[model samples]
Target: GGAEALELLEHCGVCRERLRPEREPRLLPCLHSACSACLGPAAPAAANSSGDGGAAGDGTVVDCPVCKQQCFSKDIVENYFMRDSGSKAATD
Candidate 1:
């Protein structure tokens, strides 16, 4: 009997949307991925009206859920392999 292992990688870690052709997925150095749209832009200025120089919107960084590391917006790259796999999974 030839048994094959199938690992279905679906859904964005951040937005929770199913990984498909539309929502382009970007992979981080940590190997975790999230949709490009879900991964918001880099943090804004530190100045705050309330006087607290705290970061906003996921702490001014795109946090990788799997590795729990801070990944800058500019570093995000498209995961072509994952994107293709996602498309195949959908058709299958």
Candidate 2:
């Protein structure tokens, strides 16, 4: 079965407040979040980089405006960290 929908939203990020009122602003390794629409070729116009990760195109790297840390957009989602301990407490 799929995981709880609302439970996954426990944590918060830039989009919730500083993230253009959006859900995922694509949190960077620097811990600073960015707006999906604001990410682009030069933070100005359209490019291969889209709101969501796109593998069909040669996406360009993004630089955090606050921290100046540069990284790929596709790599952001990999840090979801879903491999943590699952509710295995059976010692009750």
Candidate 3:
């Protein structure tokens, strides 16, 4: 992974966090893209907030959890992606 993908997950190798498997996951500023079930509440905003469906439910734009890159949550709902497990976390 390059600067394009990176994040720090509390779910890895630590009891400090828990892990929930996701068949379909999307990236976010937390640098984590947990399974749809994991996101639970934020999933709505994650899937249909920015310019989603193009109605009142426009998509929500947020930073990528890994690279901290800005992006839309709706992109998650519209597209299929995998979490950048190898994505590097912010190092500044």
Leading candidate by lDDT = 1
Say which prediction, candidate 1 or candidate 3, comes out ahead on lDDT.
1
Per-candidate TM-score against the hidden true structure: 0.47, 0.33, 0.30
- What's the lDDT for residue 31 in model 1? 58
CA-lDDT, candidates in order = 0.49, 0.39, 0.39
- Per-residue alpha-carbon lDDT of candidate 1 for residues 1-92, written as tens digits (9 for 90 to 100): 11111233556677776665656666655655666676544223443232245454344344566655554444554433445333234343
Give the poorly placed runs of model 1, Cα more than 4 Å off: 1-8, 41-61, 71-75, 78-82, 85-92
Candidate 1 clash pair list: none
Better of 1 and 2 by lDDT: 1
By TM-score, the best candidate is: 1
Cα RMSD, model 2 = 11.3
Model 2 over residues 1-92: C-alpha lDDT tens digits? Answer: 12222333322333233322233344445554444444433232344444465432334355555554445555543344332223424353
Candidate 3 residue-wise lDDT, 1-92, digit = tens: 22212333434221223333323344354446444544444433424433545633224544333443345464443443444434333452
